Amino acid sequence: YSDVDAILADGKQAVAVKHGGGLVVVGELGAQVLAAKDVSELPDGV
């Protein structure tokens, strides 16, 4: 990704990071894995 609009245009979401650097990028799959509690709530792919 070159510009900040690329993530938005691509469809990925972007979270600003405070302590260190910044701008971690989240995709819908990555979020859904990231939103998992137990082995049941991870996606099919993983």
Binding site: Y1, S2, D3, V4, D5, I7, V17, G21, G22, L23
Partner: protein, 97 residues
Amino acid sequence: GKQIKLYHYVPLLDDRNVNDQGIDAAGATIANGNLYGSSKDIGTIPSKLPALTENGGRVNRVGFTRIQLIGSIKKFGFFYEWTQEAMDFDTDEELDS
């Protein structure tokens, strides 16, 4: 302590600004803390220009560097010795000068 230290603040765009505080428009893992250094190549600067967008935020971060200098002092010396007779009974009565 027989030594003297200094600080030589390197400018931003100089390629001596080695820095870890490097964030591009999208990511933050840029090792090149300086925007583009002094590469001075048309194929580089447009890519590395700080092109901010409508939405701002945590984009194009930079850091700065300082340089420490060091210099030390040393001791030197020598000597010569003469006897009274060497001055008294010498062919030239100007040896002292």
